[PDB]
Ligand binder design. Structure first.
Ligand SMILES: *[C@@H]1O[C@H](CO)[C@@H](O[C@@H]2O[C@H](CO)[C@@H](O)[C@H](O)[C@H]2NC(C)=O)[C@H](O)[C@H]1NC(C)=O
Ligand SMILES: *[C@@H]1O[C@H](CO)[C@@H](O[C@@H]2O[C@H](CO)[C@@H](O)[C@H](O)[C@H]2NC(C)=O)[C@H](O)[C@H]1NC(C)=O
Ligand SMILES: CCCCC/C=C\C/C=C/CCCCCCCC(=O)O
Ligand SMILES: *[C@@H]1O[C@H](CO)[C@@H](O)[C@H](O)[C@H]1NC(C)=O
Ligand SMILES: *[C@@H]1O[C@H](CO)[C@@H](O)[C@H](O)[C@H]1NC(C)=O
Ligand SMILES: *[C@@H]1O[C@H](CO)[C@@H](O)[C@H](O)[C@H]1NC(C)=O
Ligand SMILES: *[C@@H]1O[C@H](CO)[C@@H](O)[C@H](O)[C@H]1NC(C)=O
Ligand SMILES: *[C@@H]1O[C@H](CO)[C@@H](O)[C@H](O)[C@H]1NC(C)=O
Ligand SMILES: *[C@@H]1O[C@H](CO)[C@@H](O)[C@H](O)[C@H]1NC(C)=O
Ligand SMILES: *[C@@H]1O[C@H](CO)[C@@H](O)[C@H](O)[C@H]1NC(C)=O
Ligand SMILES: *[C@@H]1O[C@H](CO)[C@@H](O)[C@H](O)[C@H]1NC(C)=O
Lengths: 214, 85, 211, 377, 197
């Protein structure tokens, strides 16, 4: 983790580089969207950068050993991504324009606030959720940073219909999720349906009951 | 395939064995070739042909001349056509 | 960016095509177009080089072509295991180096499934909490190319919505979720909202009205 | 100081015949009372040369960029010193080296550096009446000259520059050749009295100079002088008068000529051995007179029109990096033998990776390696 | 001297060619003549004398010959096939090298076509290796066409720098002004004599 306005050093290995036509571009990937190009260094000492990054990032190769340096400075917290070292593919002296050797990259995260506890609401069973024999109710646990969070139903009792959906990462930088379970519509309020919310990086433990709408 | 030359290329009826690329005549000049991309046989024929004689009444009388193309039949491979053919 | 349709799948042992349909001056005006592959967790692997070439390995089912501003990939015979993302890529003008968007490629040996949708309005405690969130859950929709659109009483909305990427369950189908942020005064402003999901041309929508 | 001129009228090009013009001494040996057969770059007899002028009143300042194919015959008929020199080069725009031969009113200047030439380079003479004189005023040829390699400046003099009104009184002929980095110039001056249409006659051009410039030349352009006086209001691009001069351009080709040296050693006549069959016979007879009869000449020749290359469909490059760049070689008593199959032989990719210090070929010359196909490699 | 891509060319005018004065000042280790035998150098007069000079690597000294290929002979310096002069080269590691490398000496690495004989290409336009142009910046498939030798003093011989002088000239046929060390005599006319003009 690093607060915005920071800096970071990303290094890779330029084994067999000093021959001309040996480009070694850098490529990012957001956790869910897809690939996007970042920068490129040409072995004749030329550097080029993508837009929206230009001026903030800098490649400075170490011709001494073999190490290639990308210095990120003043991160804007829309750069959270895997970062890969893409080495080019060469057909003689002609750069083919494709990247054949990758390096599994480094996860680079940029956030703020550090950590925070979840806020819980019960999503009541309703006729708009009811259909025939069954009706669904759940618990919405939102706005927390420390990713591992768990919500159980009735201290782990109900395993039928209980489905926790993948947490979503908002623009605010905090996660949120909602876990829902279906239960016979004859049993709207009848039995116990209490969601047990536990936040392990913090020490939050709260039980919330879900009942039909007033 | 690296073999250079000059001439006229025409479609051929010769048929090469698979291990052959060039064809030679009795004077050992290359007169047939297999095209390396379409795999078709071509004949190579030279470009110059036919004798020429010049008839002059003497350049101490005139520079008018006549020309006899000994291999042409006009009823062309000539330098000029003028009149009086 | 470039454009490629985010979902394409077919029967095992057949030919599926994937179009990259870029503009000029990167794909039409060049020839250095490549195709990659990313299994969910690994690094990308160069799958097709310029136009139509291959590295070593890469069993000859993959083929590439270019017909102007649209290059395309074609897999001839899904074994079982060529599920990937297949980013196309090109060299743009000034050392740019653009990329594609990524197309999931599954192989539902059986019959497609129906995306079960379920929608929830903001609870009462959240109303008292001076905020509001609509909850749209999607589940059991085998082929994972779902997309979502949100509706106020008659119009579409594009602000305050977050959408999970599809996630595989135990039964090896998918699930997803989307959230809509609202102030409670906007919650009671419009008489009803809805979440619609489109999936293989087909569409299913659910709707809820405030009380 | 560099202007784009205007007030110029439109006209199509004009052509003329070269009546046995453009012969030069092909060596530095003295020969007397003989007929000598020689092959070289000559201007063919009765060629179609191009005609350029510049008469105002109609304005016509011709100085376009002309090709320089294999050599150039250049002729100029003047009375008032309007053509002043030439510029030679390929792009003429400071990305490449160019040669400039110019005649100021005082010196002859030859320079082979990097010039940035204008679209309309010229010189300019100004005429005063208060002061009794035509004087050299403008020299608008180039903007910059950066990395000069060759320079020569003649001894000072002073030309006339005065505008005459009679007929063309001076013919000046030049032959320009460019071989082995040598720019050779042959020249001849002759007094004439003529009105137009370059004359007939025979005069052989003598060797003038060989400049060791070592540049590539594919185009050239002529430098003319302008006239400005109290009758040319304009501003600086419409207030000019042309003058009166004409020049003719033709191109050399490789021919066989039969030259005739009189007893004093001068070339007085020539036969172009490929103009007609009559000249073919004159030249195979080694005489200028042919007696009545019929004579055999060479067979009927046809020249090739195109050039074609047909190589197989090969895409890969040969394994230059796993033969010359291997990690571990073999010892000599058990030597390795690798088979080279269907690949492209581009040995230029090695130019930046390894030096050799021994490289000898045996059945073939090294200059024809990337023009052949090889069987068992 | 000069680097090889912009090689110098000096004009040799009316002087006496006594190459014995070099016998105690410098050894050579490469000296080959082409149109003439070395035993008749101080018995002839030479017409157009020019002296080219540059510095190359020790391994590329074999490239200075007519009918050669390689990096120098392709597009740095090309001799005609009818060459007449003499080629001279000597090792220069004690002069033109220094600790850490001497990067004052350059060579051309990329060109569209081979040079013609005896021309010079001092242009520094960026070579385009690909199909898309690059408008005067270095980058994707576009390289600066000049590289530098690295001459550190303890290199393998053949990576050490060599000074090369090429003597160009003509024999007989035209008037000359160089001549050798030969001494003249008087003119005897109307008799049978051996002569050397
Ligand atoms: C003379 O005319 C030419 C056009 O014939 C003008 O040329 C352009 O010059 C600019 C630089 O100033 C270049 O960027 C353009 O590419 C050129 N275009 C063409 C068609 O040549 C030139 O500028 C004019 N010069 C003067 C003094 O008038
Ligand atoms: C060499 O390449 C050419 C194309 O560059 C191939 O020509 C094709 O031949 C087929 C015949 O089966 C035609 O249908 C195509 O239209 C041809 N292409 C073109 C562009 O003309 C040729 O086949 C290749 N050589 C071999 C041996 O396959
Ligand atoms: C990989 C084997 C392919 C062999 C192809 C067969 C014939 C072609 C011959 C190539 C000769 C290569 C020699 C390299 C010359 C470079 C000279 C230099 O260093 O300046
Ligand atoms: C041909 O010309 C020569 C010289 O001009 C002359 O002596 C001769 O008589 C001429 N022939 C005839 C038949 O008159
Ligand atoms: C010169 O060539 C041009 C080309 O069209 C032609 O029009 C002209 O008639 C030719 N001139 C002569 C004298 O043959
Ligand atoms: C003519 O131009 C040359 C070129 O530099 C210059 O040296 C010379 O001085 C000029 N003429 C006069 C009279 O100055
Ligand atoms: C002649 O007069 C002009 C001005 O009209 C002046 O520029 C020029 O230098 C003078 N020349 C002489 C020789 O007086
Ligand atoms: C030519 O000029 C350029 C720029 O001024 C310079 O880089 C180059 O070194 C010059 N040429 C020579 C041979 O010095
Ligand atoms: C040269 O010959 C010409 C005739 O061709 C003659 O007029 C002239 O006098 C001769 N030159 C001398 C006198 O040497
Ligand atoms: C082989 O190539 C590598 C670069 O891939 C280079 O470092 C090494 O020095 C080369 N060795 C030889 C003998 O060419
Ligand atoms: C001469 O310049 C032209 C520019 O059009 C270029 O094409 C050509 O290659 C040059 N000469 C040589 C021998 O390369």
């Amino acid at each position: 983790q690093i607060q915005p306005g920071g800096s970071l050093r990303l290094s890779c290995a330029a084994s067999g580089f000093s021959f001309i036509s040996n480009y070694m571009s850098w490529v990012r990937q957001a956790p869910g969207k897809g690939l996007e190009w970042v920068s490129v260094i040409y072995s004749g000492g030329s550097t080029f950068y993508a837009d929206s990054v230009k001026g903030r990032f800098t490649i400075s190769r170490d011709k001494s050993k073999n190490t290639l340096y990308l210095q990120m400075n003043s991160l804007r917290a829309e750069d959270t991504a895997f970062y890969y070292c893409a080495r080019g593919l060469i057909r003689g002296i002609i750069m083919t324009g494709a990247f054949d050797i990758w390096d599994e990259g480094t996860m680079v995260t940029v956030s703020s606030a550090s950590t925070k506890g979840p806020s819980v609401f019960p999503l009541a069973p309703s006729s708009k959720s009811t259909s025939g024999g069954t009706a669904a109710l759940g618990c919405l646990v939102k706005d927390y940073f420390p990713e591992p969070v768990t919500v159980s139903w009735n201290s782990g009792a109900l395993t039928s219909g209980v489905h926790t959906f993948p947490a979503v990462l908002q623009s605010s930088g905090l996660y949120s999720l909602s876990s829902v379970v279906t239960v016979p519509s004859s049993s709207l309020g009848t039995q116990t349906y209490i969601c047990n919310v536990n936040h392990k990086p913090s020490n939050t433990k709260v039980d919330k009951k879900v009942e039909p709408k007033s | 395939n690296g073999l250079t030359g000059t001439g006229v290329l025409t479609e051929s009826n010769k048929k090469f064995l698979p291990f052959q690329q060039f064809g030679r005549d009795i004077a050992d000049t290359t007169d047939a070739v297999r095209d390396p991309q379409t795999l078709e046989i071509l004949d190579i024929t030279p470009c110059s042909f036919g004798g020429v004689s010049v008839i002059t009444p003497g350049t101490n009388t005139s520079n008018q001349v006549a020309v006899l193309y000994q291999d042409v039949n006009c009823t062309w491979r000539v330098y000029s056509t003028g009149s009086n053919v | 960016a470039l454009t490629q349709p985010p979902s394409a799948s077919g029967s095992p042992g057949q030919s599926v095509t994937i179009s990259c349909t870029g503009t000029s001056s990167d794909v039409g005006g060049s020839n250095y177009v490549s195709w990659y592959q990313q299994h969910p967790g690994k690094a990308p692997k160069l799958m097709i080089s310029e136009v139509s070439k291959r590295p070593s390995g890469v069993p000859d089912r993959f083929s590439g072509s270019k017909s102007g501003n649209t290059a395309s990939l074609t897999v001839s015979g899904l074994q079982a295991e060529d599920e990937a993302d297949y980013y196309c890529s090109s060299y743009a003008g000034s050392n740019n180096w653009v990329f594609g968007g990524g197309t999931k490629l599954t192989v539902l040996g059986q019959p497609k499934a129906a995306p079960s949708v379920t929608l929830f309005p903001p609870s009462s405690e959240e109303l008292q909490a001076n905020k509001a969130t609509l909850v749209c859950l999607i589940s059991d929709f085998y082929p994972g190319a779902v997309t979502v659109a949100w509706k106020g009483d008659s119009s579409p909305v594009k602000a305050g919505v977050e959408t999970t990427t599809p996630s595989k369950q135990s039964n090896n189908k998918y699930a997803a979720s989307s959230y809509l942020s609202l102030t409670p005064e906007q919650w009671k402003s419009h008489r009803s909202y809805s979440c619609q999901v489109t999936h293989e041309g087909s569409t299913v929508e659910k709707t809820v009205a405030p009380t | 100081q560099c202007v784009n001129l205007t007030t110029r009228t439109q006209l199509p090009p004009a052509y003329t015949n070269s009546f046995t013009r453009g012969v030069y001494y092909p060596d530095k040996v003295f020969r007397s009372s003989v007929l000598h057969s020689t092959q070289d770059l000559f201007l063919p007899f009765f060629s179609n040369v191009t005609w350029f002028h510049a008469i105002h009143v109609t304005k016509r300042f011709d100085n376009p960029v002309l090709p320089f194919n294999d050599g150039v015959y250049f002729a100029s008929t003047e009375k008032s010193n309007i053509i002043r020199g030439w510029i030679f080069g390929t792009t003429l725009d400071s990305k490449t080296q160019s040669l400039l031969i110019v005649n100021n009113a005082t010196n002859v200047v030859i320079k082979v550096c990097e010039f940035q030439f204008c679209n309309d380079p010229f010189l300019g003479v100004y005429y005063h009446k208060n002061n009794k004189s035509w004087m050299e005023s403008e020299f608008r040829v180039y903007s910059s000259a950066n990395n000069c390699t060759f320079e020569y400046v003649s001894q000072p003099f002073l030309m006339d520059l005065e505008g005459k009104q009679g007929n063309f009184k001076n013919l000046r002929e030049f032959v320009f050749k460019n071989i082995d980095g040598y720019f050779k110039i042959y020249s001849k001056h002759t007094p004439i009295n003529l009105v137009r249409d370059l004359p007939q006659g025979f005069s052989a051009l003598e060797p003038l100079v060989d400049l060791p410039i070592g540049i590539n030349i594919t185009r050239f352009q002529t430098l003319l002088a302008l006239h400005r006086s109290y009758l040319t209001p304009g501003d600086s691009s419409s207030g000019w008068t042309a003058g009166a001069a004409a020049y003719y351009v033709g191109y050399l080709q490789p021919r066989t000529f039969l030259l005739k040296y009189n007893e004093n050693g001068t070339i007085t006549d020539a036969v172009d051995c490929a103009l007609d069959p009559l000249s073919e016979t004159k030249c195979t007879l080694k005489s200028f007179t042919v007696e009545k009869g019929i004579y055999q000449t060479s067979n009927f020749r046809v020249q090739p029109t195109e050039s074609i290359v047909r190589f197989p469909n090969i895409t890969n490059l040969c394994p230059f990096g796993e033969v010359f760049n291997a990690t571990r070689f073999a010892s000599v008593y058990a030597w390795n033998r690798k088979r080279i199959s269907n690949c492209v032989a581009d040995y230029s990719v090695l130019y930046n990776s390894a030096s050799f210090s021994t490289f000898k070929c045996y059945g073939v010359s090294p200059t024809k390696l990337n023009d052949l196909c090889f069987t068992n490699v | 001297f000069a680097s090889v891509y912009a090689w110098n060319r000096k004009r040799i005018s009316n002087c006496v060619a006594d190459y014995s004065v070099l016998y105690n000042s410098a050894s050579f280790s490469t000296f080959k003549c082409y149109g003439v035998s070395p035993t008749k150098l101080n018995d002839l007069c030479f017409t157009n004398v020019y002296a080219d000079s540059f510095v190359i690597r020790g391994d590329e000294v074999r490239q200075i010959a007519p009918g050669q290929t390689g990096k120098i002979a392709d597009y740095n310096y090309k001799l005609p096939d009818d060459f007449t002069g003499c080629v001279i080269a000597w090792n220069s590691n004690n002069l033109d090298s220094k600790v850490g490398g001497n990067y004052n000496y350059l060579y051309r690495l990329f060109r569209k076509s081979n040079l013609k004989p005896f021309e010079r290409d001092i242009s520094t336009e960026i070579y385009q290796a690909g199909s898309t142009p690059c408008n005067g910046v270095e980058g994707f498939n576009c390289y600066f066409p000049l590289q530098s030798y690295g001459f550190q003093p303890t290199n393998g011989v053949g990576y050490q720098p060599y000074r090369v002088v090429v003597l160009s000239f003509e024999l007989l046929h035209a008037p000359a002004t160089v001549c050798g060390p030969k001494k003249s005599t008087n003119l005897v006319k109307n008799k049978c004599v051996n002569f050397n003009f």
